[PDB]
Amino acid sequence: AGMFRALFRQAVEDDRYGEFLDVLAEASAFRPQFASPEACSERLDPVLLAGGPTDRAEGRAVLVGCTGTAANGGPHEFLRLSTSFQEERDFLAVPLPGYGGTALLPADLDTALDAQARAILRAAGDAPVVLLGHSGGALLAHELAFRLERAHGAPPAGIVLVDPYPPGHQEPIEVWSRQLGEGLFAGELEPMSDARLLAMGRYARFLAGPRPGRSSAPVLLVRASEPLGDWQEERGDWRAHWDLPHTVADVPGDHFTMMRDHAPAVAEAVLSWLDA
């Protein structure tokens, strides 16, 4: 077992990361899947990683971390960032359906989003919700926001997109594909399972498909300040992008280190924005 990981490693060495992700997406279609949010084969209950002031237990929006697609990710994704919200805001990390190796994969993105929506609404209660995601997780946070609005009549109070690269601005992901792939292998707490690599490929494909809806929630765009890899100035702007953001905040670090070594800066931008 583990052939997908082996092929993956080779693809990165050969600078064919993008091509391999397509293969993962195609292969993933043959994994058992759940067609109903209710038929989800796993507990999506968010985990409380930080607690806000017990004092003003009034309305106050709660932060919900939308786990990204990285096959090397999981419950550890928001550990560093969340510490900065302790005594400031409750922070709930919600799992992405299909990971954690017999977990069923979602038949389509909306089905996975509904499963998450239900777990989130139950956990948040009457508190307003502000979704937060990084990279693939940022793209998922927005899709989730729109779903909550249209299928659960509950649009979040806001969306925090950390370093998103939406369709239309994928040149940096293409140019730095090798670093994005190496970054995945680096920082892996354990070897990525083929099941999780398949899940990653499936979500990547979901995010590339027709996604009409735009959330009415205000968005905070948090951008890395340093390029992940070499970039020829003539190509244009390598920085992350979102169309018509409510606020834009720049933080130190690159696509990866902005969260790894400068999470406090990210948290700081979020808190100041929430107050406003």
Place this chain on the structure above:
Amino acid sequence: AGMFRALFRQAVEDDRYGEFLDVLAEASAFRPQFASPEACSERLDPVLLAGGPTDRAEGRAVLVGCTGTAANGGPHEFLRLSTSFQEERDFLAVPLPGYGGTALLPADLDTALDAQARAILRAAGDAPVVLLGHSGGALLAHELAFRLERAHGAPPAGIVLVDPYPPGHQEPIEVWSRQLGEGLFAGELEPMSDARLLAMGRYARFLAGPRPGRSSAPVLLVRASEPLGDWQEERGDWRAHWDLPHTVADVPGDHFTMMRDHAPAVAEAVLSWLDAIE
């Protein structure tokens, strides 16, 4: 076993054999490979599975079984058939490069063919060679024959194609793809490794590619007499095909049983043909 095997199992269940084979081929591109026959991995030394009469050892053609693409196959493929050649003809089985991951996959078909050619010519000596293959192996036998002729200055003395379904004539085998998939699992002596499933996908892709060269070697076309699945005579002939074969022989059984339960019939047709050809 491996994830690819698991996925393939599901693909077959869902009747999506063709689609998964395509996935296997695409994935095989990320496996280490050899671009030079001299750079090949394993030893392709043909194995002697049957011995012919000692009374003659100079002009009699020797049979060379060309291993097929099945990920569950290997050294076992021609065992049952070879039995009928004992005391009749030497029967050598040549491995298909890339199977047992470790084993490097050929960069292209010609590279694998060249590796096989070298091994076969070394083993055959001055004895003429008649290539024999079943299904995918039949297509491979002809491709090998052409390469032998075009790049090794040695066309084989003949080619035995057992139930080939060449490009332009594979609708029956595509319609019956589910049974092909079930046959693979229903025939494993051990779980098919993901490495061999990838090799199988890569060769399948090779054989679907453009290969205009036709061997000048005479062809014996052996066809199964029973359909592997449902067909409906309105659809046309479901049988295996080859353009203008020198001789055609029909044997009992289907695409698969012809090489098991009815292997003696296949061997009989071959021996009979070798005599007429010689």
